[PDB]
Amino acid sequence: SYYPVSDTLPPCYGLQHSLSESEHLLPLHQFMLPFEQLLACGCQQIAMLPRLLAFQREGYEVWGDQWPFKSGSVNDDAHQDYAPALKDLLGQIALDSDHELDIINYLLGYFGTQRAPRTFTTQLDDFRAVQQGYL
Amino acid sequence: ENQILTQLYGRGWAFPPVFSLEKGVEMAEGAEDVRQSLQILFSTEPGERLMRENYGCGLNDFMFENIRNELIAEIESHIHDNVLRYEPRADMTDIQVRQSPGMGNTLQVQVMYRLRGSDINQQIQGV
Amino acid sequence: ENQILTQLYGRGWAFPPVFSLEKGVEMAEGAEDVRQSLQILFSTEPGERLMRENYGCGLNDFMFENIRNELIAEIESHIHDNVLRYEPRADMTDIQVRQSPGMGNTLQVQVMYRLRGSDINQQIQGV
Amino acid sequence: LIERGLAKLTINAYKDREGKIRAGTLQAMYNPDSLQLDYQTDYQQSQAINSEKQSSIYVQAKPAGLSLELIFDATMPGNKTPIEEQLMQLKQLCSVDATSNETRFLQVKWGKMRWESRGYFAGRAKSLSVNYTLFDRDATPLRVRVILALVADESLVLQETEQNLQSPAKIALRIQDGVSLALMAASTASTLSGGVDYLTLAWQNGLDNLNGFVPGEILQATR
Amino acid sequence: LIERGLAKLTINAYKDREGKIRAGTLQAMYNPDSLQLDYQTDYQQSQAINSEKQSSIYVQAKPAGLSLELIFDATMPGNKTPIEEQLMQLKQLCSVDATSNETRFLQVKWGKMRWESRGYFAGRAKSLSVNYTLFDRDATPLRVRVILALVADESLVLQETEQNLQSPAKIALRIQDGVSLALMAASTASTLSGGVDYLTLAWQNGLDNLNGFVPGEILQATR
Amino acid sequence: MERLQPGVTLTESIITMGQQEIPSAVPVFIGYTVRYPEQSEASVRIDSLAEYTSLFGDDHVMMFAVRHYFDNGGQQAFVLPLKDNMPSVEMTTAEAENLIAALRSATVSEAIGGHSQITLILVPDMARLNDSDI
Amino acid sequence: VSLWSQGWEALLQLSQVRPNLFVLLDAPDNVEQAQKCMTTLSSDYRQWGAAYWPRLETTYQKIFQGTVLSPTAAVAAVIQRTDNDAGVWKAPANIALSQVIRPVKSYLQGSVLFNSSGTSLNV
Question: A39: distance to nearest CA of chain D, Å?
Answer without folding.
Answer: 14
